Amino acid sequence: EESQAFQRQLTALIGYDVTDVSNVHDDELEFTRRGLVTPRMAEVASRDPKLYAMHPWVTSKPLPEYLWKKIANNCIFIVIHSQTIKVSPDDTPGAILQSFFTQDFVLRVCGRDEYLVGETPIKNFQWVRHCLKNGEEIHVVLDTPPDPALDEVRKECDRKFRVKIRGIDIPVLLTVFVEANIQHGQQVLCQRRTSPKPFTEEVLWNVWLEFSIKIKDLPKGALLNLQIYCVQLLYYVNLLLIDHRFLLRRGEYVLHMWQISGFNADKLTSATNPDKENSMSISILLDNAEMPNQLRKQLEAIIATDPLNPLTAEDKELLWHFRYESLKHPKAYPKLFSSVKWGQQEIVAKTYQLLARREVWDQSALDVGLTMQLLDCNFSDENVRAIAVQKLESLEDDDVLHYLLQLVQAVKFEPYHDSALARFLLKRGLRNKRIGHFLFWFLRSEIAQSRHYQQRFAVILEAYLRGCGTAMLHDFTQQVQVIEMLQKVTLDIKSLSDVSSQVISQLKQKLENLQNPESFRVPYDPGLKAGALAIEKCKVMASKKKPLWLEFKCADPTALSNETIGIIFKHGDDLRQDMLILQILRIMESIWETESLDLCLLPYGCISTGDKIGMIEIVKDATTIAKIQQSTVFKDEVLNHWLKEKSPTEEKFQAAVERFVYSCAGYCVATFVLGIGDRHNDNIMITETGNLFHIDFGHIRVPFVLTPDFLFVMGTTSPHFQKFQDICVKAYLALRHHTNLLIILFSMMLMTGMPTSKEDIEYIRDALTVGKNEEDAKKYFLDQIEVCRDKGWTVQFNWFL
Template sequence: MPPGIYCPMEFWSKGENQNIQVDFLLPTGIYLNLSVPCNASLGAIKQVVWKHAQYEPLYHMLSDPEAYVFTCINQTAEQQELEDEQRRLCDIQPFLPVLRLVAREGDRVKKLINSQISLLIGKGLHEFDSVQDPEVNDFRTKMCQFCEERAAKRQQLSWAAWMEYNFPLQLEPMAKGLGTGLSHTPVKNIFVNVKFQSGGTRGMKQERGILFSGVDSLLHSASCRVFADRSSPCGFMVFSYFFSPQLVVQAGLFHGNEMLCKTVSSSEVNVCSEPVWKQRLDFDINICDLPRMARLCFALYAVIEKAKKARSTKKKSKKAVGSVHYCTKETTDCPIAWVNVMLFDYKDQLKTGECCLHMWSSFPDEKGELLNPMGTVQCNPNTESAAALVICFPNAASHPVYYPSFEQVGNTDVFLRGFLLQLKEILERRSHTELYEHEKDLVWKMRYDIRDQYPQALAKLLTITKWNKHEDVAQMISLLQTWPELPVLNALELLDFSFPDRYVGSFAINSLKKLTDHELFQYLLQLVQVLKYESYLDCELTKFLLDRALSNRKIGHFLFWHLRSEMHVPAVALRFGLILEAYCRGSTHHMKVLMKQGEALSKMKALNEFVKLSSPKATKPQAKEMMHVCMKQETYLEALSHLQSPLNPSIILTEVCVDQCTFMDSKMKPLWIVFNNEETGGGGVGIIFKNGDDLRQDMLTLQMIQLMDVLWKQEGLDLRMTPYGCLSTGDKTGLIEVVMHSDTIANIQLNKSNMAATAAFNKDALLNWLKSKNPGDALEQAIEEFTLSCAGYCVATYVLGIGDRHSDNIMIRETGQLFHIDFGHFLGNFKTKFGINRERVPFILTYDFVHVIQQGKTNNSEKFERFRGYCEKAYMILRRHGPLFLHLFALMKAAGLPELSCSKDIQYLKDSLALGKTDEEALKHFRLKFNEALRESWKTKVNWLAHNVSKDNRQ
């Protein structure tokens, strides 16, 4: 370890007024040790250093202070140049309290911007500079130029257009009709929201020449070297009858998730530190039949032989050698690592020559397959510990081989009009069952009829296309040029990993360009995940997202945080980091806002770590007081004031209300932080900061609930949903919006009861609480709000398979709106205890809910039947939009959520929406679930009883 005092991150979160001894290394070779405040800025520290340096030798050799810049070793053991002298020492958090002054070189403004971008995206730009990859360099140059051009155009905008960009107006979705059952009272003021829409942009067309080769083989030879970081002596004698594990490399060619030909495997070699095969692997496919997006997938695995005694029904024959018996052998494949590589580079050239592929050690859970075609084509950046596979692509010809551009192919098919009815039946099947071979042949033969009469069935046509036949590929790409523009639903489907072809992707993006900003924001979460499927850095989706982000600051804001939150993932850090760099260069004025938010999040994380350390040693009031003392420091007050809310950038958080802040009792001690709102009469804004919990599943669930709300309102049904804000900002860190003036059902029941054991069965507690919050005529409106929202969340939680429902994650607003929180389990992944399923009802509909809906009357069946009607109507609306939910969840498989990793998880949606049934059968199915939820609600009350007794945390 290097000499000096190691300063962990916790060291810098101590009292702001403390001083620290810092070693300063001057350019003249002079060493100074000075005591400086932790919260001092670099500019102030430099003045102190110069004041003391004038009494030291060689002072006359120093230039002006502005000619020098501080450098330090940061917490990741890298040398960092500190260009921004407004930053405080406690925010920089150097690994050692040592600062070195070096002569400033180059353009200071440019270096300052680079330094700020590095800090903002969580990755030094020098790491991109050191990557010896022409694709990275070309992409950076092209995207930076693209974004800077957009920024230059933005500078020429009129005042109104500039305001539209910075503060985009939002159109709140509203029910078309007033027939939702709500009682309406005349109001004096009418608020009108106006929304601007942005137009589309044109894509770029590139043409390439083609050179064919008749060589059948693709991969010439392969060898693998697995580098071990340590060696261990063998502690026992190895005899010949011990089984020795063998290493094997398996390889396969894929186009999306379709295997182009049979996989091939190397021979077996003994396990050693540097195994070598030097073996030729041949694939049963011609080079001319390779699709443009073909990828070569490798898996390194060990063949382990298990010893098993021989079985006999008569006699056990034992042939002993010493004390050892002969045994039968069984083998199992133990996966070690995988890696993927594209066959064509980003310039469309077939790869040749030797390349070293650093492999990934994590494997997908689904099916336990060795090859991982859905995985990234980026190599593992952790080259020191990763296994390295060295392969060599042969020279297929004496000249470079390029993939061709599309060529128009004449229509030589006969219109089979007699099969149109059969074709219609095949294309309109709602189930996603595999087509028979004769059906595939019919679909392919009638592809022109599909284009003209059923253009929305493009995905099915692409699915049956033979991507390992270049003639079919050429005809499909040619046909795509004349295909009509698709609706958004069908365009989103084409972004799935199953359709990797670049022309298909470009066609899908062109169809998405008609999306309004509000609609694009609705699907932004999925579009960011789709970036992980892209094989090359420069793609249409990246340019589309950057273009729209630079045209609307709200989209830019959330695009930034969706990308920034996954910068800790090695497989996407390079791609996401380059996109973030491009966005920052195209929106330098937005960088200041984002840096302020990043500083606030950094302080929240430090505060949370402080609370975690102090809470076990003190009572909650004492820990809360220590938290307040920490927050009242100048550095915290400055960081947590005058910033745009990351959850909603249209809200300005003026100052933090320290006395109203606290922390929650759960394991990770989430912070409950309250801010003043700049808007007049806006009231307080509450934010929960979580550190240690993955919020991505909550984000997805809330996005789906918000989408359901939009779909219902489009059909004239306003169910008073509360899709509160939630944003993942980093590795298991994020923010959740606090719904003010609300309480949990557990707190309401416990506060209205004398004992926790009886609270769950107090059916009057909810109604009495609503009466206390809504006196007089307001009670009827509150009950109506409760009825509508209860119907919405009953349907939403059933369709999405939300689990772990108890009285502490169901809340009610004082206005009567019911809503659910904490979506840690969904898609039917319910919790079990001792092998017993804790979720015993399709959704939560207890008798105390019914008691409120019926206004406290036992015979008010009219109100309850109206509630049932809301549920049935809401369910049937979602069912009509079932494919949209399937596509959105399928696109999220790239996120790596534990409960959304395979097709079985999405199957739950198909079952809950009864997509394989008729409307009449589906409605009957839902009515059975509704009656079951009501009939078995006593089981829910028993669960709530156990929860209330074990976690009596009434407030």
């Protein structure tokens, strides 16, 4: 019937068929599809239609200091379409409108689908704060509120554990054996191997592997991890010993395994390879007083350490024995729940009784860095994860948007498809259209290039789409259609090809043919809508990847400016890594705002849409530093010359120098903390207004980039180089303040986004001077600056080969 065409539309929007049972040895995905219907409706019938439709983008955080200094009269001016209006920072949109009259109309941003509504002071609107920071005028049209009826929803034993390894079978391709582990949160409880047999297209053991753990000592979320060794590891697969119904798993299983490439999240997935034609297969059978002072100081020293500091046996024994003393410190929860012998039923019962009375945790101030630790790979126990999701529950929509991408990624560490974190993301994306849009796109990015997790993400995405609303369904449909057309064009043009006459001819020809998709919401900026193509401005960038440089017209006639919307379609670069780096940059900007800092980072929008294919935003009036040097020529005087050229007034040039010092310090600190500071001059752009910023972080000696050209822009010691060295240490110590959060986000990004062992992660710990006084860390960063000085253009020149 038509309710089936609705499901076909859902499939087309998802990129994967959630009704397909071709790759399932149980009903877990459908069980989760059915279990999600309750939270979906619960959030749908509970959301305010008016505020949901207008989705005001608001924050409760105070107005920073650097933004107060820009309103030196306590008078914000709102231009309504048209007259200007004086307003107080604490003046509500309702008060503003009723003072404009002296009844039902609403103020909507000009050239955007954004609204300044709700019982919030204009001081607390993100659009207003963006205008203030960038010195822009608040233009708004008096429009009629959008119809909430458009968001209407289409209503819907003591015996030891034994495993029979029968054999392996592969029609593809030494000696090979089978290793069967019982993992819980990457903790191997017991391990058993088989005897090494000749590696052939069919190896039968018919062997009972007898484990050391008892049946009733198995914890929920425990994985039977089956791997094949040749000594190297070639194939891996996972089975949930306790399923979504708390039933010990029994029966015959023919599991198609994943192959290894020559640690990361994909090695943990309960999904099996859907390529049953080529993939290796495995066949198995299942049939079954208070402390003294010295110890207190030791325990506090333990709790105080960083997330990456490993716990020794004595440390874990100490944490467990004084578990009730450790429960008073929220900072010790990760290290406390790692000392648990999860392969013992009595100890897990004790752990649950401990979780029973956790007043100090419930009352503690929300700590995101402490929640992420409990949501990462090390914790399989669903109650331990549920306490972290509980702490997330209190985040405002702005903070959810801050950590949305990495929480979506953290969904990969959930043992079961139906998880508290999944339900939280569903609720929060249904409660806000902006969270919903970015959730859609992150889930779709993962569904489109991850066989390990496409099924779970597709179930979640369908659950969301069922409640997001018919209007948003239309929006997403338009966006998907447009991106698909554009990626087809990108791939064809990349096949055809520096640049050829025929290439430009064909590009403009295909763009003219394609335009006959009237308007679509910009995926990386849901406030913006793009209309017709400006074909004259469309080109092929002549990069090694031959990406598409497209420019659109804004479909909103209320838009004041005539600037086009610039997008770059790119195949060849893995843009999931770029998304992760940009999101961490936004997180660093937030950490700096906490201390009234603004290093003017330019985290341009970027969305990964498929395997090594994505889209990138195009910032205003920006060019590469290496290009600036090529123009006039290795020469350091060139950057200030270009700045003078592009800035008309002397005052504008000084403002550009200020902005440059700020953005340069920001990117220096960030790129050092993340280990992507040693960059080619070609991958560092700057805006005509002096704003510097790095690009293309995909697939990525000196600590960072501070070449003598930037220094000449600073003048060298000079009065502004001193400002540089000052802002640097300021922001660096600000980040060291959030050291733990930065480390946990770094490790999660490495696990869920990069090709990743222990050594890779510790670079961030070293760069953040873990266990160092702030003075010594400041001296360390100044030494890094001095290294940048001493090296000069040696590495820059070296790259040229």
